[PDB]
């Protein structure tokens, strides 16, 4: 009644990446980088950079 | 008309809805890998010198 893993923003692979990565600058950079959506605007903004 | 800069700061953002950006900042935002792409034709056709 509290947490539907399918219908959720932060699914289980991001939890695995959180639990497995070493705490570093580059891991913070990665976890910001994986918050990008699969939207066509995200594809456009990723093509431009 | 008057030498009061404070109201000049106030009377511009007075719940300002439309925020139009200039072409120059939109030029220098994007890098060179997409500036020559034909999607950026309007920014390219006024960069002639």
């Amino acid at each position: 009644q509290l947490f539907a893993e399918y219908r959720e923003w932060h699914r289980s692979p991001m939890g695995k990446y959180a639990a497995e990565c070493l705490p570093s600058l580059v891991s913070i950079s990665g976890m910001t980088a994986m918050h990008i959506k699969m939207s066509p605007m995200a594809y456009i903004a990723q093509a431009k950079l | 008309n008057h030498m009061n800069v404070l109201v000049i700061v106030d009377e511009f953002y007075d719940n300002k809805y439309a925020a139009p950006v200039t072409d120059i900042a939109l030029k220098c935002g994007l890098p060179t890998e997409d500036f020559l792409h034909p999607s950026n034709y309007d920014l390219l056709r006024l960069e002639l010198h």
Partner: protein, 74 residues
């Protein structure tokens, strides 16, 4: 066509210290077709003007010479 809002500035300073010699040069201003609040802000401006003028005098008179040649004998 406006300014910043007025600061808090609690209390009336001349009421608690009426014994300072700035009061006789303070007590000449009066309201003339003027409400109590704008006259009060003018009083605040005149008070801070007189105190600034007075501390400028007390700076100038003490920094003519901070020692003196006259203090050698005593």
């Amino acid at each position: 066509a406006r300014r910043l809002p007025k600061p808090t500035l609690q209390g009336r300073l001349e009421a608690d210290f009426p014994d300072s010699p700035l009061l006789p040069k303070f007590q000449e201003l009066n309201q003339n077709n003027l409400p109590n609040d704008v006259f009060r802000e003018a009083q605040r401006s005149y008070l801070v003007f007189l105190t600034s003028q007075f501390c400028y005098e007390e700076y100038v008179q003490r920094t003519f010479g901070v020692p003196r040649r006259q203090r050698a004998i005593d």
